[PDB]
Design an enzyme around this catalytic site. Structure first.
Site, mmCIF file in Angstrom:
data_model
loop_
_atom_site.group_PDB
_atom_site.id
_atom_site.type_symbol
_atom_site.label_atom_id
_atom_site.label_comp_id
_atom_site.label_asym_id
_atom_site.label_seq_id
_atom_site.Cartn_x
_atom_site.Cartn_y
_atom_site.Cartn_z
ATOM 1 N N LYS A 87 10.164 -15.097 17.954
ATOM 2 C CA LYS A 87 9.610 -16.444 17.774
ATOM 3 C C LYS A 87 9.195 -16.668 16.319
ATOM 4 O O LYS A 87 8.088 -17.147 16.056
ATOM 5 C CB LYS A 87 8.367 -16.621 18.657
ATOM 6 C CG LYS A 87 8.548 -16.324 20.139
ATOM 7 C CD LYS A 87 9.340 -17.413 20.830
ATOM 8 C CE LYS A 87 9.221 -17.315 22.349
ATOM 9 N NZ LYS A 87 9.632 -15.980 22.871
ATOM 10 N N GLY A 125 11.740 -21.365 37.667
ATOM 11 C CA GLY A 125 13.084 -21.878 37.487
ATOM 12 C C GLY A 125 14.079 -21.244 38.439
ATOM 13 O O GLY A 125 13.830 -20.172 38.993
HETATM 14 O O1 LIG Z 1 10.139 -21.030 26.260
HETATM 15 C C1 LIG Z 1 10.206 -19.824 26.307
HETATM 16 C C2 LIG Z 1 10.735 -18.933 25.294
HETATM 17 C C3 LIG Z 1 10.872 -17.611 25.539
HETATM 18 O O2 LIG Z 1 11.482 -16.849 24.742
HETATM 19 N N1 LIG Z 1 10.332 -17.024 26.730
HETATM 20 C C4 LIG Z 1 10.394 -15.544 26.908
HETATM 21 O O3 LIG Z 1 11.303 -15.270 27.939
HETATM 22 C C5 LIG Z 1 10.835 -14.217 28.795
HETATM 23 C C6 LIG Z 1 10.635 -14.796 30.177
HETATM 24 O O4 LIG Z 1 10.273 -13.722 31.034
HETATM 25 P P1 LIG Z 1 9.931 -13.946 32.573
HETATM 26 O O5 LIG Z 1 11.339 -13.958 33.355
HETATM 27 O O6 LIG Z 1 9.089 -15.166 32.818
HETATM 28 O O7 LIG Z 1 9.202 -12.719 32.986
HETATM 29 C C7 LIG Z 1 9.626 -13.640 28.071
HETATM 30 O O8 LIG Z 1 9.975 -12.529 27.236
HETATM 31 C C8 LIG Z 1 9.107 -14.802 27.255
HETATM 32 O O9 LIG Z 1 8.312 -14.400 26.122
HETATM 33 C C9 LIG Z 1 9.762 -17.850 27.761
HETATM 34 O O10 LIG Z 1 9.360 -17.379 28.812
HETATM 35 N N2 LIG Z 1 9.719 -19.195 27.467
#
Ligand SMILES: O=C1CC(=O)N([C@@H]2O[C@H](COP(=O)(O)O)[C@@H](O)[C@H]2O)C(=O)N1
Ligand SMILES: O=C1CC(=O)N([C@@H]2O[C@H](COP(=O)(O)O)[C@@H](O)[C@H]2O)C(=O)N1
Lengths: 217, 218
Positions: free
Chosen positions: A64, A179
């Site tokens: 990021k 999602g």
């Molecule tokens: O808008 C965003 C950007 C992003 O990179 N991420 C990253 O995507 C991953 C999502 O993981 P998870 O499937 O929710 O556990 C994590 O490493 C977050 O830091 C996110 O969740 N939302």
């Protein structure tokens, strides 16, 4: 970018042993791993090389990047020196900060992913209202890789419209954040999955389950 | 609030362990607060924080501009404080929940959070500037006590100070290399951050002394 099964693993475990074990357990399903600060700050940047040696997988450094141009260039250089194939950069800080990253990526043969809108609730406060413009900025700058929210398919669809079919789009938010993988893949080239895989009692079965649900895609 | 010696914070962005240590050591008699960011951490590891503490015993502000979702922000903060950082800098543009996540970890771990409002570079005018006042107000509402504002835009730094109040702690980057003036910056900020103007000088100690001399009356 050929992402196996259109599924990217978000390896946010903070223990080298567990991160390596879990990743190995799903290696037959995924060949693209997103490594972020949770793992890097806990185990060091050498973890990236360890992953390429053990799995020969693609590595996306989810840092990021959101600093001034000068610092952004240094961050990208250190990241690519560690072996990352691509890096994720925030667009909110402006065009010059993104350009700084694009320059280093071109110099070292890597890719820059532009994060437009984020997936969490807080993204609605400031990021969402600027997302479309950030996306257009990416187009103006020649950016070809983007990141959009799985949690807001209508927003993800809008992002796809702005960047076109040629651009590459990955999307986090499916699973833990609510999602749906299948819906996400209607607009994104690949869906990111973290907790839904690495926190599952059986990571391998979890990964297999996700793929089974999008088998027709 | 932290007692920053001479109201000057060193932005140690050298990426070489040996050079970073040499320069920091040479200016230790003028600065006791060091800002360590990703250029150095991604090049030498989080243990660099441990080495700075051992060698200089200086306060450490981890400039990681945390800008992720709440869940990830929490992990970043935990790893950073575990390493020995006294404080961490967080972006406010990702929203209140992301900032709150950092504040919660800081509270639980006995450390501090600095909220970055407006940035100092030209690109900050595109999206950040328009949201800066609200980001600052959000910080106040969340209980944030430490902030970061731009030295390159005195008018904006002044407004930020008004929003956060005189009791809040404010540090500001942009003086020197980016064009800002240390003196003018300290009219609103508690401490000024200086990177290149110090670490790229032929004599970092003389550079630091020079900056302090120009603001002795402050
Ligand atoms: O808008 C965003 C950007 C992003 O990179 N991420 C990253 O995507 C991953 C999502 O993981 P998870 O499937 O929710 O556990 C994590 O490493 C977050 O830091 C996110 O969740 N939302
Ligand atoms: O708006 C901001 C925030 C910030 O942290 N910084 C940081 O402050 C330092 C400024 O260094 P320099 O004095 O311009 O060399 C760097 O470490 C930057 O990453 C900045 O320049 N502008």
């Amino acid at each position: 970018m050929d992402v196996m099964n259109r599924l990217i693993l978000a390896m946010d475990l903070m223990n080298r042993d567990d991160a390596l074990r879990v990743t190995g357990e799903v290696r037959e399903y995924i060949d693209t791993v997103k490594i972020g600060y949770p793992l890097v700050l806990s185990e060091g940047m050498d973890i990236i090389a360890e992953f390429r040696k053990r799995f020969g997988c693609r590595i996306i450094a989810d840092f990021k990047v959101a600093d001034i141009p000068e610092t952004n260039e240094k961050i990208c250089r250190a990241t690519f020196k560690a072996g990352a194939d691509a890096i994720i950069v925030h667009g909110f800080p402006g065009a010059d900060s993104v350009r700084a990253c694009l320059n280093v990526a071109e110099e070292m043969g890597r890719e820059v992913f532009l994060l437009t809108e984020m997936s969490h609730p807080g993204a609605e406060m400031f990021i969402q209202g600027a997302a479309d413009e950030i996306a257009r900025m990416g187009v103006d700058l020649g950016v070809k890789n983007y990141v959009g929210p799985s949690t807001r398919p209508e927003r993800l669809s809008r992002l796809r419209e702005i960047i076109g079919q040629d651009s590459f789009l990955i999307s986090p938010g499916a699973g833990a954040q609510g999602g749906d993988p299948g819906e996400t893949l209607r607009f994104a080239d690949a869906a990111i999955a973290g907790r839904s895989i690495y926190l599952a009692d059986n990571p391998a079965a979890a990964a297999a389950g996700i793929i089974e649900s999008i088998k027709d895609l």
